[PDB]
């Protein structure tokens, strides 16, 4: 039932402290939909974000991020919301039984990693003076390495099959977007071999030249 917001809000933050995400989110949703324009319902929406993230309710977390950013384009705490959106995408990406068996989820679907990289890039470009920028940048590095590994695996397969120009396009895009990764360094030999197999070595000497220059 409805009552003054004091007791309901106090119980809400108290059970957030206890960590009972179920009852916490039920209470918060009830209070928010009861007072859709309360004095400080924005804090309630932030608590909704936190509850969805910690309760493993990721799609609802993403939807609530989108709703909050649409209703509140400018606020002293946008960086937190965008960081949570990126965290949502990150967490959705990497978690399964391969985590138990330690299988590199590198050549799987990269879409979620791509979206997370986009959101973290938006954040780090936006407010470098915030407090989440360092962890964000570390996540940027990890994600970029991951995408490079995925493209490397695709190129490796296409070489294995014998399609000698799809590999060229793939590794060329890899160079054009991942200039500072291990994957491109390892894929340069794929360039060399592919150019060799086309009877047009003229670019193959250049590939060997750049390989020798950067091999050290």
């Amino acid at each position: 039932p409805d009552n003054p917001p004091n007791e309901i809000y106090a119980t809400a933050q108290q059970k957030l402290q206890d960590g009972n995400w179920r009852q916490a989110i039920t209470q918060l949703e009830a209070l928010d939909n009861r007072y859709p324009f309360g004095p400080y319902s924005q804090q309630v929406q932030l608590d909704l974000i936190y509850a969805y993230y910690k309760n493993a309710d990721l799609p609802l977390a993403q939807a609530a991020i989108d709703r909050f950013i649409r209703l509140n384009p400018t606020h002293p705490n946008i960086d937190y919301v965008m960081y949570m959106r990126g965290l949502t995408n990150m967490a959705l990406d990497d978690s399964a039984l391969q985590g138990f068996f330690g299988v590199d989820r590198s050549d799987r679907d990269p879409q979620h990693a791509r979206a997370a990289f986009s959101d973290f890039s938006k954040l780090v470009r936006g407010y470098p003076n915030s407090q989440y920028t360092t962890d964000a940048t570390k996540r940027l590095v990890f994600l970029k390495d991951r995408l490079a590994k995925y493209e490397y695996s695709v190129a490796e397969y296409y070489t294995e099959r014998g399609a000698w120009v799809a590999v060229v396009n793939r590794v060329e895009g890899m160079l054009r977007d991942y200039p500072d990764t291990q994957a491109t360094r390892d894929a340069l030999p794929l360039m060399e071999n592919a150019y060799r197999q086309m009877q047009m070595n003229a670019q193959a000497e250049k590939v060997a030249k750049i390989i020798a220059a950067n091999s050290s």
Binding site: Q17, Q43, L87, F142, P179, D180, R185
Partner: protein
């Protein structure tokens, strides 16, 4: 709890090292959006970061700001603060200069769990005449918590939240 959900595996990421073209050679790499701007550190990484909603004042909270911004007998907050300093917190301000209304409190050890033993600080208060209502600052001092001394944008908001919620209770 209190950290990010995922593992700290990305903390062990490989270094981001670029490559240089040789003589008489060009390189088209600078043609995408996957560029990582260089930024300094001094940020809580790994599980050390405290992901937790930044509780809003419930006005001005840019730094440690705790000024009070519609009331006529707005001076009634000081006896209410005395009531707050009474059984409400059982703690009379360290310098309760009510005549000058500069009732600066003393450092405490209030606790709210969250894997934290205690978190209390001297939320210094002064009551000027600003804005529509009778102004009253809540600028806190150095926050103690379990640490000897420490401060952070969210951390200072935690101690200020205690002054924020209680002062707003008087409404």
């Amino acid at each position: 709890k209190r950290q990010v959900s995922g593992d700290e595996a990305y903390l062990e990421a490989a270094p981001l090292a670029e490559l240089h073209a040789p003589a008489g050679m060009i390189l088209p790499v600078t043609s995408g959006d996957y560029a990582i701007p260089v930024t300094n550190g001094s940020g809580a990484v790994g599980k050390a970061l405290d992901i937790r909603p930044p509780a809003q004042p419930l006005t001005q909270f840019t730094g440690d700001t705790a000024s009070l911004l519609e009331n006529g007998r707005g001076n009634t907050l000081w006896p209410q603060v005395v009531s707050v300093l009474q059984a409400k917190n059982y703690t009379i301000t360290q310098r309760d200069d009510a005549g000058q209304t500069l009732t600066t409190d003393w450092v405490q050890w209030n606790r709210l769990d969250e894997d934290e033993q205690y978190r209390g600080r001297y939320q210094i208060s002064v009551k000027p005449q600003g804005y529509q209502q009778a102004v009253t600052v809540k600028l806190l001092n150095l926050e103690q918590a379990g640490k000897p001394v420490a401060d952070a944008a969210s951390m200072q908001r935690y101690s200020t939240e205690m002054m924020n919620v209680i002062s707003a209770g008087l409404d």
